[PDB]
Short mmCIF file of C-alpha atoms and ligand atoms in Angstrom, two decimals:
data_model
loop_
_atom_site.label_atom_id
_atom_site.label_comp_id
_atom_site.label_asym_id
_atom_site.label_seq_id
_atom_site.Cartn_x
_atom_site.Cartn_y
_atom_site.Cartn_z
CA UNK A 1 45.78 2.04 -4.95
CA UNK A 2 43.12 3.21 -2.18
CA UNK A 3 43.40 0.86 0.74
CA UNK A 4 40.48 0.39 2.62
CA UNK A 5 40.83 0.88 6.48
CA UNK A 6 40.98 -2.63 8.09
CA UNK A 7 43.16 -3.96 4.98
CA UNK A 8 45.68 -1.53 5.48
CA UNK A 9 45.75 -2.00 9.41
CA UNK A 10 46.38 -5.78 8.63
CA UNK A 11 48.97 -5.06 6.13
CA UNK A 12 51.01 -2.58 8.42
CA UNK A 13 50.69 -4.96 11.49
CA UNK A 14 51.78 -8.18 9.10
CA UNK A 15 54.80 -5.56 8.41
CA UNK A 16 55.74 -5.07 11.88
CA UNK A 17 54.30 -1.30 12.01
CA UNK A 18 52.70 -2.31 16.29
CA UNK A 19 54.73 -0.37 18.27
CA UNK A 20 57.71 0.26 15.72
CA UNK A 21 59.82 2.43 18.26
CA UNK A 22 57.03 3.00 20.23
CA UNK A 23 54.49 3.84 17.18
CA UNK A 24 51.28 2.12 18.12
CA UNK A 25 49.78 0.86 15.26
CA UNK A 26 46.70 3.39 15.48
CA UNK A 27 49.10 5.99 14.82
CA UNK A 28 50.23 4.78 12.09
CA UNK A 29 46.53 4.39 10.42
CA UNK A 30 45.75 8.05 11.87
CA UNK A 31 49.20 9.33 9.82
CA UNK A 32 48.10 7.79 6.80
CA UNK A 33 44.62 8.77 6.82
CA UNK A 34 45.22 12.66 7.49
CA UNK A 35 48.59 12.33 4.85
CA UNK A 36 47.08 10.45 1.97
CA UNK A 37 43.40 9.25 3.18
CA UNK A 38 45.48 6.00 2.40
CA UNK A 39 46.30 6.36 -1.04
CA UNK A 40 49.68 4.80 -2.41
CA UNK A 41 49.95 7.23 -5.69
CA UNK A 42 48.97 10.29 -3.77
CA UNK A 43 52.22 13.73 -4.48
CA UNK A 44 52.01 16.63 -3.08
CA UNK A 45 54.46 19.50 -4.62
CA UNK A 46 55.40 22.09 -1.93
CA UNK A 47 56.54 25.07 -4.77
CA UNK A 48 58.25 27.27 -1.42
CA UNK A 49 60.71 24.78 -1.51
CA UNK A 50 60.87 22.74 -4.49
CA UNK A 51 60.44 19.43 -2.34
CA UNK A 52 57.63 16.74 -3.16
CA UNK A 53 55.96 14.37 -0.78
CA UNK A 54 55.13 10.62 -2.22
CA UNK A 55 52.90 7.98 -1.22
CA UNK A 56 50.85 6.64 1.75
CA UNK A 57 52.96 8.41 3.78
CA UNK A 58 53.89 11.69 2.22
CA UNK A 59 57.55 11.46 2.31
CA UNK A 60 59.39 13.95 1.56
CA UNK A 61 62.32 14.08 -1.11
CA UNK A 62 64.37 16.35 0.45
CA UNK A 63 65.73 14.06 2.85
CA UNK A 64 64.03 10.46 2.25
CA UNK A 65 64.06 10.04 -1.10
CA UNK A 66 65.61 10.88 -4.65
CA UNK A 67 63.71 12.24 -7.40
CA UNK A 68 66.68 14.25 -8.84
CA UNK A 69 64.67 17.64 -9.00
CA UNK A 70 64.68 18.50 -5.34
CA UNK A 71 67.76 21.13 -4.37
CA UNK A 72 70.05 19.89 -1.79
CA UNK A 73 68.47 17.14 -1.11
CA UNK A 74 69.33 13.89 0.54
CA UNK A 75 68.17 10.27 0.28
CA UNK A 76 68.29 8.43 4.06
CA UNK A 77 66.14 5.37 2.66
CA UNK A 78 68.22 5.03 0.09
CA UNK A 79 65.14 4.67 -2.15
CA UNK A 80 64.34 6.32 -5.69
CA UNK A 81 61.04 8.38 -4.53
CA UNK A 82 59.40 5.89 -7.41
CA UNK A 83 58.93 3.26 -4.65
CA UNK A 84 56.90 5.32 -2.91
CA UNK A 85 54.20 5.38 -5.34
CA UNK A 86 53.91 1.29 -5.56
CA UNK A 87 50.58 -0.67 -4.72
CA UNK A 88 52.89 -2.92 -2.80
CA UNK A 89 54.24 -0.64 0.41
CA UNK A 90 56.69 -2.69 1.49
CA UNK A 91 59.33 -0.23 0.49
CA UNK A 92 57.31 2.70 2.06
CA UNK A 93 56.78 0.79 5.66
CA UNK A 94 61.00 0.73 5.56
CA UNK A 95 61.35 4.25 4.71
CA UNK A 96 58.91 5.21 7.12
CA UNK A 97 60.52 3.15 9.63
CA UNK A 98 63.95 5.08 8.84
CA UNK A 99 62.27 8.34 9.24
CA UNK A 100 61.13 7.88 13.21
CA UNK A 101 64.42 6.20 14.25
CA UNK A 102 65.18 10.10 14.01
CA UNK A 103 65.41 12.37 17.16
CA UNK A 104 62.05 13.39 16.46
CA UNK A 105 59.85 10.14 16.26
CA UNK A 106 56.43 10.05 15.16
CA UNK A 107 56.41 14.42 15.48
CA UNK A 108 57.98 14.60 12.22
CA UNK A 109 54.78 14.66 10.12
CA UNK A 110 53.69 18.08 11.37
CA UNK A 111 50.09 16.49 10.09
CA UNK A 112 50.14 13.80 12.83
CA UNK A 113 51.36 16.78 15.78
CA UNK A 114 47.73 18.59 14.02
CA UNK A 115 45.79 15.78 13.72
CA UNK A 116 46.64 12.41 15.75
CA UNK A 117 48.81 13.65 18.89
CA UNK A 118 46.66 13.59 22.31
CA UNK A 119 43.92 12.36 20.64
CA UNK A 120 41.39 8.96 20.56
CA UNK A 121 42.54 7.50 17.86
CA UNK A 122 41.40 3.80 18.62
CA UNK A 123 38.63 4.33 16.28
CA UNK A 124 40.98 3.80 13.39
CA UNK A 125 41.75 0.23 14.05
CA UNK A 126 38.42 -0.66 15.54
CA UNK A 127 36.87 -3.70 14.18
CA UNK A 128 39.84 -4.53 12.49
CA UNK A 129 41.24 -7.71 13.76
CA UNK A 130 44.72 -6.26 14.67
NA1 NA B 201 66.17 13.31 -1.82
#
């Protein structure tokens, strides 16, 4: 499904997304805007690698998720990479949670460093209720 803004800043802030180790929840909406413009079925196949990216979030398989296909992968959510592609992102708010309790936080979506880092990004929860 295609959330529109102020639901999904509701939804992420119902799922504990504010400040999630240190994540304001504008970041959050600013990830999933440049990653999916907020669409839950949204894949992206990177063919250099043989990895795919799933969901909201664009999570990647060759770490976060299993889809079988991807080459020495891993699966740190402990999730098949079918969850990620729910209307319901409940299971994609834990992954994503997982993925910046890493060393690298938030910077591990090189699309949030491009983006989202340094920048105003109040105007994606503005208006919102959150
Ligand atoms: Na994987």
């Amino acid at each position: 499904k295609v959330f529109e803004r102020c639901e999904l800043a509701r939804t992420l802030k119902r799922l504990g997304m504010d400040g999630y180790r240190g994540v304001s929840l504008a970041n959050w909406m600013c990830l999933a805007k440049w990653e999916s413009g907020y669409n839950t079925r949204a894949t992206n196949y990177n063919a250099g690698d043989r990895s795919t990216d799933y969901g909201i979030f664009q999570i990647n398989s060759r770490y976060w998720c299993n889809d079988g296909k991807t080459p020495g992968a891993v699966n740190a959510c402990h999730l098949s990479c079918s969850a990620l592609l729910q209307d319901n992102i409940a299971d994609a708010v834990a992954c994503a949670k997982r993925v910046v309790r890493d060393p690298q936080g938030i910077r591990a979506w090189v699309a949030w460093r491009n983006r989202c880092q340094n920048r105003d990004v109040r105007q994606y929860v503005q208006g919102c209720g959150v």
